[PDB]
Amino acid sequence: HMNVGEILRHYAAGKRNFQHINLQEIELTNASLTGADLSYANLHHANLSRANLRSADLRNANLSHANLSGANLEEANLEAANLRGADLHEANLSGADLQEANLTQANLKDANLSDANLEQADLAGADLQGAVLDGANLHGANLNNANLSEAMLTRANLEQADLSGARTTGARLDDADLRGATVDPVLWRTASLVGARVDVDQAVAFAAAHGLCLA
Amino acid sequence: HMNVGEILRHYAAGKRNFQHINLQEIELTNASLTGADLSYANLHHANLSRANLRSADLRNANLSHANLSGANLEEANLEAANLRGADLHEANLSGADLQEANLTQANLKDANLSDANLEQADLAGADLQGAVLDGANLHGANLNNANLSEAMLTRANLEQADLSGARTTGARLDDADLRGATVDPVLWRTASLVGARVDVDQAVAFAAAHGLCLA
Numbered sequence: 126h127m128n129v130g131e132i133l134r135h136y137a138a139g140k141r142n143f144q145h146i147n148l149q150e151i152e153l154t155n156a157s158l159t160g161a162d163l164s165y166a167n168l169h170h171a172n173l174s175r176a177n178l179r180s181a182d183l184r185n186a187n188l189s190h191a192n193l194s195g196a197n198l199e200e201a202n203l204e205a206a207n208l209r210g211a212d213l214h215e216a217n218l219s220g221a222d223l224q225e226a227n228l229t230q231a232n233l234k235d236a237n238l239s240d241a242n243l244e245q246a247d248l249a250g251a252d253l254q255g256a257v258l259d260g261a262n263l264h265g266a267n268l269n270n271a272n273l274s275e276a277m278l279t280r281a282n283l284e285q286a287d288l289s290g291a292r293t294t295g296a297r298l299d300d301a302d303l304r305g306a307t308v309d310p311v312l313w314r315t316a317s318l319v320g321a322r323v324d325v326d327q328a329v330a331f332a333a334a335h336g337l338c339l340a
Numbered sequence: 341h342m343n344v345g346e347i348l349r350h351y352a353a354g355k356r357n358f359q360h361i362n363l364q365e366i367e368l369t370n371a372s373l374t375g376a377d378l379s380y381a382n383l384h385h386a387n388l389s390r391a392n393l394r395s396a397d398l399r400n401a402n403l404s405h406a407n408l409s410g411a412n413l414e415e416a417n418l419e420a421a422n423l424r425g426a427d428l429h430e431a432n433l434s435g436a437d438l439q440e441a442n443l444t445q446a447n448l449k450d451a452n453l454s455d456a457n458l459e460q461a462d463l464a465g466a467d468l469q470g471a472v473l474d475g476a477n478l479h480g481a482n483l484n485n486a487n488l489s490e491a492m493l494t495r496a497n498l499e500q501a502d503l504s505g506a507r508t509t510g511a512r513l514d515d516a517d518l519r520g521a522t523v524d525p526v527l528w529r530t531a532s533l534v535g536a537r538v539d540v541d542q543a544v545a546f547a548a549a550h551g552l553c554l555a
């Protein structure tokens with residue numbers, strides 16, 4: 126296990142290779158480790174609140190129940206990372222790679238996921254209230270029972286995503302691509318959808334969700 | 341030309357056959373001629389305000405620019421009648437037969453057309469503001485540029501009707517049959533349509549009218 130003094134001294138010396146390092150429970154609030162290779166690192170329950178991890182490599186890292194509130198993760202590689210129950214509220218994940226990441230039960234309230242890659246990510250039960258996912262790729266993402274209340278999914282790719290059980294009151298889906306997605310009828314009644322791309326079957330479902338009869 | 345005294349005396353004697361009679365411009369306000377056969381009669385610009393014409397036969401009658409405001413025409417036969425520019429505001433036309441009638445530019449404000457037959461009727465430019473057409477048959481009716489603002493067309497048959505240019509702000513079309521009708525996209529944005537029956541193409545048009553893209 127590497128401690129705070131050690132990792133900050135190494136980083137100060139210009140070292141960036143921290144792959145597979147054990148940093149469980151470490152206290153790194155307001156720390157900057159931009160560009161660090163933390164691939165496969167164990168950061169379980171780490172406190173990384175307001176840390177600057179811009180452009181860090183965190184692929185397949187264990188970030189389960191980590192505190193990443195307000196952290197900068199712009200253009201970070203979080204592919205296949207374990208972020209179950211992590212606190213990412215108000216984090217900047219703009220342009221981050223989160224494909225196939227485990228974000229189950231994560232706190233993403235007011236998170237910035239603009240232009241992020243969330244292809245096949247597992248967001249089941251995640252809280253995305255007030256989050257911004259403009260231009261994000263959610264192709265095939267699992268949004269089962271997620272909270273999307275007041276979330277901005279404008280211009281987002283939701284093709285083949287599963288939004289079963291998602292809360293969508295106040296959700297903003299203008300210009301989103303919904304083709305092939307699985308959604309509850311209530312989505313058609315709650316989301317703003319101007320410019321949203323749909324299949325014919327979905328357009329019919331939109332009409333049915335407003336009480337029209339096709340018999 | 342038969343005058344007021346003559347027709348009322350004849351009716352009082354039990355006469356009901358007034359077919360093809362000339363009654364142009366006659367003043368018959370609050371008169372009762374229930375069950376009278378006035379088929380093919382000339383009632384051009386007659387004043388029949390608040391008259392009781394329940395169950396009258398007025399088939400093919402000339403009622404052009406007649407004042408029928410508040411008149412009772414329940415179960416009256418008005419098939420193919422000329423009612424162009426007639427004033428029928430607040431009239432009771434419940435169960436009347438108006439198929440193929442000319443109602444162009446007619447005033448039907450607050451008229452009761454419940455369960456009336458309006459098959460292939462010409463209602464172009466007619467004013468139906470606040471009218472009640474619950475259960476009416478408007479199969480193939482011409483509603484071009486009609487005013488349907490706040491009109492109740494609940495449970496009405498609108499199959500193959502033409503509503504091009506119709507004003508439909510506040511229109512109430514719950515349970516109406518719209519299949520095959522021609523409508524402007526604005527209808528889908530303005531009418532209440534719970535239970536309204538539509539084709540697949542119409543359901544898609546409903547979605548498109550709310551800004552959804554089918555590309």
Ligand SMILES: [Cl-]
Binds near residue numbers: 137
């Ligand atoms: Cl440093």
Ligand SMILES: [Cl-]
Binds near residue numbers: 277279297299
């Ligand atoms: Cl928006």
Ligand SMILES: [Cl-]
Binds near residue numbers: 352
């Ligand atoms: Cl009498």
Ligand SMILES: [Cl-]
Binds near residue numbers: 494514
């Ligand atoms: Cl109603």
